[PDB]
Design a protein around this ligand. Structure first.
Ligand SMILES: Nc1ncnc2c1ncn2[C@@H]1O[C@H](COP(=O)(O)OP(=O)(O)O)[C@@H](O)[C@H]1O
Ligand SMILES: [Mg+2]
Lengths: 96, 470, 163, 49, 90
């Protein structure tokens, strides 16, 4: 209704304005869905992890030197040395 | 300058490449290794072990590689030729031609690794596909554009079932074919190309409509596992970019899961059931979902499964039964009796066996024929020990009708004329339903049991009984 | 005395075991220059590397080769006891891992680490990390910074998810 | 269905052209983009300390 | 350069086409060395037993002995043939 494309561009204008506080790690090894992320001491168990490529992850195995996270998608874009940011929450889903 | 790597480890099909720079290759990346034969060596990346090192899987023999060889990266996956230029030629797993007819002059080259269709791009239907067999047009009917599975053991009839269906359905389908053989024999590849050229399927000097993909069991484990992705990329382009009903014929489909289990132990993965890989349901689901019917075009998949040592409860046979609309299990016990082929009616099932797709007349004939065979099979313990005289009056008439109905569904194929000696019979869908309903009502009870074995419909059963009694 | 640096537990405990005895009477400054001479005279030398990485020799032959090379180099204090423990337990093949973990203890308890963007940061040796990172980020962004990305990639991914 | 497909194709074509114009402007050595990136980092660190 | 002649432990072992046997057992022989040895290449032990280098990782190489396990000990000299596992024909 009267240029519907202009309403979507104005609402998704200002969004990225508070995302400069580290809160990331480093991926040492990944393959066959698993992804060994090195670091992330503040990451809790069964927490939603977000990689640098856009694939989601779930840290299920927490060790002392690394952290085994299971990717929720394809591991073709995740490589060694990628940043694995933590969302701060657990594995949640929508309801209502 | 491209990304160059150094070979650090080499154990069979797995070859770990150690990149000196920080820009390492991603997963499913085609690697190039120079040797000395004008062919180099293809290698697909699997996972990354860290410390600037990634474990790759070679697509050929790794004999002759030393520690420290130059491994260049192509920057993408294993691409293959697609379009109309691949029809009539014998391609390999890397897209190179193996028919000694020059290079494939293709416009575009799509990769072998691609995502499947989403939930909004799917298109379901219920169109029946007439094959010509009496045991397939009444029991488990195939669907047009779906996935057909031909399960069976060694020496049952898996290779003969795919050859007879391609000579009576793919020859008049209209669209292009895709015969991608994975884990086949050396003599089966040369015999299939010579038979299709004399019938008008693959024309070297004219127009063709069947894509051939090489990949027998004589290669290594990396070429057998990647043979299914190279053949499926050519059939997907003809149904999405062109919109044609492609026909994918895999022989066999069980070689894709068996090739990856031999290389899974050297990549660091733990073994699963019966010494298989842990990602059995994830690797088989990513390739079977892409060979489906979408909104742009259909894809009739006619693959064949191989039972491991005559066992349907294996990890490579039971996992492939949930991704096929119609299944054709071939038992080894019925092949030794004289059934051509050994179409098990108590194990073959399909989704098109209903009264809303085949009609009320075809649904009643399929339920009546399956009920008579189930009663005779459950009472086999008393007929083989006490005998046939221990039954009652109702059980004696059901045992005689079940023996004649099992031999009537076994029709002689056209490709098996040199092993049987009889001509090929192709019964229609309307003739097979009328012949089974008349024999179950009591109109052919006076005929012998040998008059219906290796015949056609109701016309061939009456002519065979009159010649044997003269 | 155990410092809070973890550093693995089995392989990384080689340099942490000798740090407790070297932290007495000021003996941590001479251990940094003596550990670098043992790795530089074995890597870029092609002499004692192939004669020690093999699984041959013996227990007395490995101890005599480390004592002869340390008498003419730069080892006279507690540097001779570090090579004798790795010779009897067959740990001479990973000499680069013991020398790299010893330098991380002096840079953590007397300086900063981590990173920020592009190349390395400054790694100051003040006190807190909040008052040292704010005073060093403004002086490093103006001087240099060739910038040869993060904000452009986040804006393109948000527009594709809403279309 | 045809009106919804025409509106979705026009919005997808306009988003692809706007993404190409934003990438070409950043490669033309923007002096206003380099000065705004240094001032945004100093203002964010002062609010948290 | 001063620590080369000060050692005195025979620093002249040609590890390019040869290697030292580190361990042996269960029909295998872990050879330490042979950087120029190709995959599935023929080898020769000190006692005369043939070997085939199957897996070649970093620092070690798994050689499969084609004979008894008593003809290979720890610290033996294993040489390379330069070719793969071939046989005579004609
Ligand atoms: N319709 C038929 N009539 C007679 N024999 C058949 C028929 N179909 C298959 N066979 C027999 O089954 C055998 C199958 O052999 P093969 O293809 O090597 O094993 P598999 O079928 O398990 O792949 C053939 O030797 C053939 O003689
Ligand atoms: Mg076969």
């Amino acid at each position: 209704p009267t240029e519907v494309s202009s309403i979507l561009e104005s609402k998704i204008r200002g969004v990225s304005d508070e995302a400069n506080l580290d809160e990331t790690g480093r991926v040492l090894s990944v393959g066959d869905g698993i992804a060994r992320v090195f670091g992330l001491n503040n990451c809790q168990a069964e927490e939603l992890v977000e990689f640098a490529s856009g694939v989601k992850g779930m840290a299920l195995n927490l060790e002392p030197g690394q952290v085994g996270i299971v990717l929720f998608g394809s591991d073709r874009e995740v490589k060694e040395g990628e940043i694995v940011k933590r969302t701060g929450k657990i594995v949640d889903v929508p309801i209502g | 300058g491209p990304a160059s790597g150094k070979i650090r480890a080499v154990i069979g099909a797995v070859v770990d490449v150690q990149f000196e720079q920080g820009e390492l290759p991603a997963i499913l990346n085609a690697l190039t290794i120079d040797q000395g034969n004008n062919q180099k060596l293809v290698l697909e990346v699997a996972q990354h072990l860290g410390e600037n090192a990634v474990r790759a899987i070679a697509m050929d023999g790794t004999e002759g590689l030393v520690r420290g060889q130059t491994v260049v990266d192509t920057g993408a996956p294993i691409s293959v030729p697609v379009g109309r230029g691949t029809l009539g030629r014998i391609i390999n797993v890397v897209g190179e031609p193996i028919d000694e007819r020059g290079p494939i002059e293709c416009k575009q080259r799509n990769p072998i690794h691609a995502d499947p269709p989403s939930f909004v791009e799917q298109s379901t239907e219920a169109e029946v596909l007439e094959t010509g067999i009496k045991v397939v047009d009444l029991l488990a009917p195939y669907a047009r554009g779906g996935k057909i599975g031909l399960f069976g053991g060694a020496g049952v009839g898996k290779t003969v079932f795919i050859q007879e269906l391609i000579n009576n359905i793919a020859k008049a389908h209209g669209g292009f074919s895709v015969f991608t053989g994975v884990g086949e024999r050396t003599r089966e590849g040369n015999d299939l190309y010579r038979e299709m050229k004399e019938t008008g399927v693959i024309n070297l000097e004219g127009e063709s409509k069947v894509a051939l993909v090489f990949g027998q069991m004589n290669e290594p484990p990396g070429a057998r596992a990647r043979v299914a992705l190279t053949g499926l990329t050519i059939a997907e382009y003809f149904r999405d970019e062109e919109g044609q009903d492609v026909l994918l014929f895999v022989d066999n489909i069980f070689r894709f899961t068996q090739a990856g289990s031999e290389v899974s132990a050297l990549l660091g993965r733990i073994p699963s059931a019966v010494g298989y890989q842990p990602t059995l349901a994830t690797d088989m689901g990513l390739l079977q979902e892409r060979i489906t019917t979408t909104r742009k075009g259909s894809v009739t998949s006619v693959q064949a499964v191989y039972v491991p040592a005559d066992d349907l409860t294996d990890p490579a046979p039971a996992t492939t039964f949930a991704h096929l609309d119609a299944t054709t299990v071939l038992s080894r016990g019925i092949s030794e009796l004289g059934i051509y082929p050994a179409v098990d009616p108590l194990d073959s099932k399909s989704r098109l066996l209903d009264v809303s797709v085949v009609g009320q007349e075809h649904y009643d004939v399929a339920t009546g024929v399956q009920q008579t065979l189930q009663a005779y099979k459950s009472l086999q313990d008393i007929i083989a020990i006490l005998g046939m005289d221990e039954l009652s009056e109702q059980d004696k008439l059901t045992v005689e009708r079940a023996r004649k109905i099992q031999r009537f569904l076994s029709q002689p194929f056209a490709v098996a004329e040199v092993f049987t000696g009889i001509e090929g019979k192709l019964v229609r869908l309307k003739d097979t339903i009328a012949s089974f309903k008349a024999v179950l009502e009591g109109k052919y009870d006076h005929l012998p049991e040998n008059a219906f074995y290796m015949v056609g419909g109701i016309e061939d059963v009456v002519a065979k009984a009159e010649k044997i009694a003269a | 005395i155990k410092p809070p640096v973890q550093l693995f537990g089995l392989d990384g405990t080689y340099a942490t075991a000798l740090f407790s005895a070297s932290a007495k009477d000021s003996s941590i400054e001479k251990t940094f220059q003596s550990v670098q001479k043992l790795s530089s005279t074995i890597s870029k030398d092609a002499k004692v590397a192939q004669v020690l990485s093999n699984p041959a020799l013996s227990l007395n032959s490995r101890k005599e080769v480390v004592s002869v090379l340390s008498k003419e180099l730069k080892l006279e204090p507690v540097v001779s006891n570090l090579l004798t423990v790795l010779a009897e337990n067959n740990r001479l093949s990973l000499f680069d891992s013991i020398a790299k973990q010893f330098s991380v203890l002096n840079d953590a308890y007397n300086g900063v680490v981590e990173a920020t963007v592009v190349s390395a940061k400054p790694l100051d040796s003040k006190i807190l990390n909040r008052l040292t990172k704010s005073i060093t980020n403004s002086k490093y962004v103006g001087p240099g910074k060739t910038l040869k990305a993060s904000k452009v990639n986040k804006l393109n991914k948000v527009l594709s998810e809403t279309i | 269905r045809y009106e919804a497909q025409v509106r979705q194709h026009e919005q997808e074509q306009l988003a692809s052209t706007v993404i190409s114009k934003v990438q070409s402007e950043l490669q033309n050595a923007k002096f206003q983009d380099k000065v705004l990136a240094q001032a945004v980092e100093e203002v964010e660190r002062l609010f948290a300390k």
